[PDB]
Each structure stands twice: as C-alpha cells, then as structure tokens.
Tab-separated table of C-alpha atoms and ligand atoms in Angstrom:
chain	number	residue	atom	x	y	z
L	1	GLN	CA	3.911	31.916	1.668
L	2	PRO	CA	0.115	32.029	1.253
L	3	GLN	CA	-2.128	32.099	4.367
L	4	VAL	CA	-2.607	28.636	5.903
L	5	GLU	CA	-5.745	28.167	7.997
L	6	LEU	CA	-6.940	24.773	9.284
L	7	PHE	CA	-10.572	24.478	10.284
L	8	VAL	CA	-11.147	21.770	12.889
L	9	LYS	CA	-13.980	20.381	15.070
L	10	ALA	CA	-14.769	22.302	18.286
L	11	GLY	CA	-15.636	20.476	21.530
L	12	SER	CA	-18.228	20.561	24.319
L	13	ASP	CA	-18.032	24.343	24.855
L	14	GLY	CA	-18.246	25.104	21.076
L	15	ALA	CA	-14.702	26.610	21.222
L	16	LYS	CA	-11.911	24.249	22.489
L	17	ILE	CA	-10.435	21.384	20.381
L	18	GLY	CA	-12.979	18.565	20.212
L	19	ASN	CA	-12.583	14.862	19.470
L	20	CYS	CA	-11.497	14.387	15.798
L	21	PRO	CA	-8.476	12.242	14.698
L	22	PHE	CA	-8.577	13.714	11.123
L	23	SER	CA	-8.247	17.275	12.528
L	24	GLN	CA	-5.389	16.128	14.767
L	25	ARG	CA	-3.625	14.372	11.866
L	26	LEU	CA	-3.560	17.652	9.814
L	27	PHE	CA	-2.622	19.721	12.902
L	28	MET	CA	0.401	17.345	13.357
L	29	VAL	CA	1.421	17.576	9.688
L	30	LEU	CA	1.396	21.400	9.709
L	31	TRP	CA	3.311	21.476	13.012
L	32	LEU	CA	5.932	19.048	11.638
L	33	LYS	CA	6.275	21.110	8.431
L	34	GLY	CA	7.330	24.203	10.419
L	35	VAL	CA	4.987	26.414	8.326
L	36	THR	CA	3.239	29.458	9.863
L	37	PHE	CA	-0.410	28.475	10.239
L	38	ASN	CA	-3.646	29.253	12.120
L	39	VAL	CA	-6.255	26.840	13.542
L	40	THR	CA	-9.924	27.801	13.790
L	41	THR	CA	-12.358	25.566	15.696
L	42	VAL	CA	-15.856	25.185	14.256
L	43	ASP	CA	-18.965	24.396	16.307
L	44	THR	CA	-20.490	22.146	13.661
L	45	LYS	CA	-23.992	22.951	14.971
L	46	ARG	CA	-23.474	26.759	15.218
L	47	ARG	CA	-21.340	27.667	12.212
L	48	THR	CA	-20.240	31.214	11.392
L	49	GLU	CA	-21.286	32.830	8.086
L	50	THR	CA	-17.560	32.807	7.073
L	51	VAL	CA	-17.311	28.996	7.562
L	52	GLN	CA	-20.788	28.439	5.989
L	53	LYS	CA	-19.495	30.318	2.916
L	54	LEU	CA	-16.005	28.711	2.727
L	55	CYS	CA	-17.368	25.166	3.100
L	56	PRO	CA	-21.084	24.891	2.308
L	57	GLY	CA	-20.957	21.069	2.224
L	58	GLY	CA	-20.298	20.954	5.966
L	59	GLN	CA	-17.064	18.907	5.715
L	60	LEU	CA	-14.736	19.064	8.756
L	61	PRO	CA	-11.745	19.301	8.858
L	62	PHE	CA	-11.028	21.639	5.941
L	63	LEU	CA	-8.087	23.813	4.900
L	64	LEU	CA	-7.885	27.329	3.484
L	65	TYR	CA	-4.571	27.769	1.620
L	66	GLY	CA	-4.297	31.182	-0.045
L	67	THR	CA	-7.864	31.664	-1.290
L	68	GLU	CA	-8.733	27.971	-2.014
L	69	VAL	CA	-10.668	25.576	0.264
L	70	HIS	CA	-9.438	21.946	0.388
L	71	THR	CA	-11.609	19.058	1.699
L	72	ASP	CA	-10.902	15.282	2.339
L	73	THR	CA	-8.118	14.755	4.901
L	74	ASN	CA	-6.163	12.321	2.661
L	75	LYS	CA	-6.179	14.902	-0.176
L	76	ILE	CA	-5.321	17.877	2.099
L	77	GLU	CA	-2.293	15.925	3.433
L	78	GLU	CA	-1.187	14.970	-0.080
L	79	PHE	CA	-1.405	18.699	-1.108
L	80	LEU	CA	0.520	19.915	1.974
L	81	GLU	CA	3.260	17.290	1.500
L	82	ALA	CA	3.672	18.449	-2.118
L	83	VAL	CA	3.549	22.283	-1.700
L	84	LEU	CA	5.381	22.500	1.653
L	85	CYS	CA	8.553	20.792	0.465
L	86	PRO	CA	12.411	20.988	0.627
L	87	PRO	CA	14.565	22.978	0.948
L	88	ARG	CA	12.155	25.271	2.894
L	89	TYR	CA	10.073	22.508	4.570
L	90	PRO	CA	10.893	18.889	5.505
L	91	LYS	CA	9.617	15.969	3.411
L	92	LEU	CA	7.327	13.974	5.744
L	93	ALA	CA	6.323	11.004	3.548
L	94	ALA	CA	7.427	7.586	4.755
L	95	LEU	CA	10.123	5.830	2.727
L	96	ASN	CA	8.657	2.300	3.360
L	97	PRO	CA	5.080	1.845	1.964
L	98	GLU	CA	4.189	-0.682	4.733
L	99	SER	CA	4.581	2.120	7.330
L	100	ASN	CA	1.446	3.737	5.762
L	101	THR	CA	-0.708	0.615	6.383
L	102	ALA	CA	0.671	-0.775	9.690
L	103	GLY	CA	-2.001	-0.611	12.410
L	104	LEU	CA	-4.620	1.130	10.200
L	105	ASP	CA	-7.212	-1.563	11.038
L	106	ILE	CA	-6.889	-0.861	14.832
L	107	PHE	CA	-9.327	2.093	14.686
L	108	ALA	CA	-12.084	0.043	12.921
L	109	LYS	CA	-11.624	-2.886	15.412
L	110	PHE	CA	-11.873	-0.313	18.270
L	111	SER	CA	-15.058	1.222	16.785
L	112	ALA	CA	-16.750	-2.179	16.589
L	113	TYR	CA	-15.672	-2.999	20.184
L	114	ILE	CA	-16.785	0.372	21.674
L	115	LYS	CA	-20.127	0.703	19.819
L	116	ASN	CA	-21.186	-2.885	20.574
L	117	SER	CA	-24.048	-3.427	23.044
L	118	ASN	CA	-24.298	-7.303	22.704
L	119	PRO	CA	-22.654	-8.798	25.831
L	120	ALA	CA	-21.991	-12.078	23.937
L	121	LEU	CA	-19.662	-10.266	21.481
L	122	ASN	CA	-17.583	-8.270	24.007
L	123	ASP	CA	-14.773	-10.830	24.292
L	124	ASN	CA	-14.589	-11.482	20.532
L	125	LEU	CA	-14.413	-7.761	19.667
L	126	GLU	CA	-11.798	-7.220	22.413
L	127	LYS	CA	-9.795	-10.143	20.926
L	128	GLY	CA	-10.125	-8.477	17.470
L	129	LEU	CA	-8.683	-5.200	18.843
L	130	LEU	CA	-5.868	-7.058	20.696
L	131	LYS	CA	-4.947	-8.963	17.517
L	132	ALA	CA	-4.831	-5.768	15.449
L	133	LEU	CA	-2.579	-4.202	18.089
L	134	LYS	CA	-0.310	-7.313	17.995
L	135	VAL	CA	0.139	-6.928	14.204
L	136	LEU	CA	1.200	-3.278	14.761
L	137	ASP	CA	3.528	-4.523	17.549
L	138	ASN	CA	5.093	-6.955	14.998
L	139	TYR	CA	5.653	-4.107	12.520
L	140	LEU	CA	7.338	-2.014	15.264
L	141	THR	CA	9.660	-4.808	16.457
L	142	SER	CA	10.553	-5.937	12.907
L	143	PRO	CA	13.722	-4.290	11.622
L	144	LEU	CA	13.110	-1.938	8.702
L	145	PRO	CA	15.373	-2.129	5.586
L	146	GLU	CA	17.588	0.648	7.102
L	147	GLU	CA	18.349	-1.620	10.095
L	148	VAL	CA	19.328	-4.712	8.028
L	149	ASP	CA	21.578	-6.998	10.115
L	150	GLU	CA	22.225	-4.116	12.563
L	151	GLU	CA	20.717	-4.721	20.804
L	152	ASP	CA	18.759	-7.957	20.302
L	153	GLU	CA	18.641	-10.077	17.196
L	154	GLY	CA	15.675	-9.373	14.990
L	155	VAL	CA	14.357	-6.668	17.331
L	156	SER	CA	14.013	-3.154	15.982
L	157	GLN	CA	15.107	-0.202	18.106
L	158	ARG	CA	13.683	2.690	15.965
L	159	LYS	CA	11.469	5.355	17.589
L	160	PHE	CA	8.580	5.551	15.100
L	161	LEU	CA	6.761	3.624	12.285
L	162	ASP	CA	9.252	4.419	9.509
L	163	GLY	CA	12.467	5.234	11.321
L	164	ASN	CA	13.671	7.714	13.941
L	165	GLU	CA	11.694	10.727	12.508
L	166	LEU	CA	7.902	11.370	12.629
L	167	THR	CA	6.303	10.787	9.200
L	168	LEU	CA	2.797	11.311	7.651
L	169	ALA	CA	2.209	7.634	8.686
L	170	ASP	CA	2.551	8.570	12.404
L	171	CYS	CA	0.262	11.631	11.866
L	172	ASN	CA	-2.548	9.331	10.769
L	173	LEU	CA	-2.064	6.522	13.311
L	174	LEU	CA	-1.144	8.370	16.547
L	175	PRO	CA	-4.426	10.425	16.920
L	176	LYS	CA	-6.403	7.173	16.393
L	177	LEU	CA	-4.289	5.252	18.976
L	178	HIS	CA	-4.757	8.181	21.397
L	179	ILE	CA	-8.581	7.824	21.116
L	180	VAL	CA	-8.364	4.005	21.499
L	181	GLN	CA	-6.372	4.344	24.756
L	182	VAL	CA	-8.506	7.109	26.344
L	183	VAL	CA	-11.902	5.620	25.448
L	184	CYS	CA	-11.071	1.968	26.339
L	185	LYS	CA	-9.529	2.986	29.721
L	186	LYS	CA	-12.671	4.989	30.625
L	187	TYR	CA	-15.414	2.622	29.420
L	188	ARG	CA	-14.000	-0.908	28.956
L	189	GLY	CA	-11.426	-1.434	31.724
L	190	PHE	CA	-9.015	-2.021	28.784
L	191	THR	CA	-5.327	-1.138	28.482
L	192	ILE	CA	-2.838	-2.084	25.709
L	193	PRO	CA	-0.967	-5.094	27.175
L	194	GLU	CA	2.476	-4.304	28.636
L	195	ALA	CA	3.828	-7.337	26.727
L	196	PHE	CA	3.303	-5.375	23.454
L	197	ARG	CA	6.723	-3.680	23.971
L	198	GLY	CA	6.926	-2.339	20.421
L	199	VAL	CA	3.621	-0.494	20.832
L	200	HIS	CA	4.560	0.926	24.284
L	201	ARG	CA	8.055	2.076	23.115
L	202	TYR	CA	6.376	3.771	20.118
L	203	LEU	CA	3.781	5.518	22.323
L	204	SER	CA	6.578	6.511	24.771
L	205	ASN	CA	8.629	8.161	22.034
L	206	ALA	CA	5.448	9.747	20.537
L	207	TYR	CA	4.103	11.355	23.774
L	208	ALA	CA	7.583	12.851	24.364
L	209	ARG	CA	7.124	14.844	21.094
L	210	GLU	CA	5.081	18.056	21.450
L	211	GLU	CA	3.807	17.722	17.839
L	212	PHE	CA	1.668	14.772	19.050
L	213	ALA	CA	1.147	15.509	22.781
L	214	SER	CA	0.206	19.175	22.256
L	215	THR	CA	-2.239	18.431	19.416
L	216	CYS	CA	-4.290	15.950	21.509
L	217	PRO	CA	-7.756	17.098	22.470
L	218	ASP	CA	-8.318	17.032	26.280
L	219	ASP	CA	-9.205	13.536	27.669
L	220	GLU	CA	-12.633	14.850	28.758
L	221	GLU	CA	-13.480	15.893	25.194
L	222	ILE	CA	-12.698	12.405	23.811
L	223	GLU	CA	-14.545	10.686	26.705
L	224	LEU	CA	-17.636	12.917	26.142
L	225	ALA	CA	-17.594	12.261	22.360
L	226	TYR	CA	-17.753	8.460	22.982
L	227	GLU	CA	-19.985	8.510	26.093
L	228	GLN	CA	-23.282	7.575	24.355
L	229	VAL	CA	-21.984	4.641	22.282
L	230	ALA	CA	-19.628	3.320	24.978
L	231	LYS	CA	-22.183	3.299	27.788
L	232	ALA	CA	-24.695	1.254	25.711
L	233	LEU	CA	-23.169	-2.106	26.731
L	234	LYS	CA	-24.917	-3.043	30.023
R	301	N70	C1	-0.458	12.392	27.993
R	301	N70	C2	0.601	11.333	28.030
R	301	N70	C3	1.933	11.638	28.284
R	301	N70	C4	2.831	10.575	28.364
R	301	N70	N1	4.176	10.824	28.600
R	301	N70	C5	5.292	9.965	28.682
R	301	N70	C6	5.158	8.604	28.444
R	301	N70	C7	6.257	7.767	28.511
R	301	N70	C8	7.507	8.287	28.806
R	301	N70	O1	8.567	7.433	28.929
R	301	N70	C9	7.656	9.651	29.021
R	301	N70	C10	6.550	10.484	28.968
R	301	N70	N2	2.440	9.304	28.198
R	301	N70	C11	1.139	9.108	27.924
R	301	N70	N3	0.747	7.827	27.651
R	301	N70	C12	1.422	6.579	27.672
R	301	N70	C13	2.672	6.484	28.274
R	301	N70	C14	3.422	5.330	28.158
R	301	N70	C15	2.932	4.252	27.433
R	301	N70	O2	3.716	3.146	27.296
R	301	N70	C16	1.677	4.329	26.843
R	301	N70	C17	0.925	5.486	26.962
R	301	N70	N4	0.190	10.064	27.837
C-alpha cells in the first residue's frame, strides 16, 4: 500500500481543521475505505516549502498517493474509489445515480442566501433554500428500488441517500449540509424545518457515524469562515 497523505485547509490558528467541505468529503472517503492515511493541514497563507513544491498551483485540498500529487476533489475521489477497491477495501459508489444528484443544489442556494446583503431578497433566498431542502426531503422519503413495495406506505425507512450504508454521495452532501446548518443557525435565525422528517432522520443517522461527526471542523471555525459575508445583511 503506497503512502496516502491528504492535504487539507487549516483554520484560524493555521493548524487545526478549517472550514472546507471538499477537504471533509475526502477525509470521509478515506475513513470509510479503512485505508491507513495521514492528514496534513495547510495554512494557505503560510505554506511550507514541501507543500509549495508538491502543489505549486495552490489547489486545496490535494492528495499525495505514493509519489504522485492529485488535484480536483471530484477526480481524487474517482481515483480513490478505483484504486482502493474490493476485496481489500469497500466499494463506496452509490448504486442509484439519482443519489449522486439529490440535494446538490442546496449548497448554492445557501451561498446565495448567506452572501446576500439586499434586505428585499432575504425571504426569496430563504424560500429558495427551503425548497431545495424539500426536494432532498422527497428523495429521502421516496422508496429506492431496493425497497419496492416493502412501516408506512410510500415512505422510505433507509438511513442514508442510497441505502443503509454511507456512500460517496453522502461524503459530498453531508459536509455541505453541516455548513448550511451551522452558518444559518448563527447568522440567519434559520433551522431546517422539523416537518422535513426525511432530512432530520438522515442527519440523525449521519451524526451517529464517527466518519461524518469526527471529520467536521469545529463550529467556531465554520462560523469564523462565514462571518464577513453573513454579517453584511443589516
Ligand atoms: C454535532 C451533532 C451531533 C448530533 N448527534 C445526534 C443527533 C441525533 C441523534 O438522534 C443522536 C445524536 N446531532 C447533531 N445535529 C442534528 C441532530 C439532529 C437533527 O435532526 C439535525 C441535526 N450535531
């Protein structure tokens, strides 16, 4: 097994895990694979000569596998899924393609809502975020093919996006939903409605798994990363 080293964004002290959902996605994938790996945080503004040499372009996160440097989170994940494979490592790819797209617009709707400083658009952007979350809720309550005609009628009982196991689809979405919750609670008085039972059951099962909970940056780090844009709305 070649050396596996993930290089991620450092936080406010230039050392701890900082806000970065792409870094958390890859941290979750490696943890779920069961591979032996190392994580090195990078102060993007005070880089080491080693990091400056490995990745001169400045991209973060990045992965060192053996002697090669891999950039672009989507491509790093595709590589890891392919080279860390059965029988030694579990296959993490979702079986249902729709699991890879469910809720992916939530993060962009959140970004528009949190960066906005026009008071006349606050309600519209909040409605946009709520609607995107409802679509994810519909995916989570809709029975997957595995559950065909399987307890309430037409209501799914699975733990995660694609079934009862964490997949690459959850690795991408969960770090983004974590940021949405922490930032909106702190600066918008916003919480995901309790009526979205599919979303809350999913988050409940997800936070009970150390692969997600233990890869989260501290709340303070996320709040500090969004402080400037989120406080603009007066
Ligand atoms: C750090 C952390 C831990 C945590 N743990 C948890 C949540 C639900 C549960 O039944 C058992 C444990 N829950 C959250 N967030 C949360 C919990 C429930 C929800 O419905 C939505 C978010 N955040």
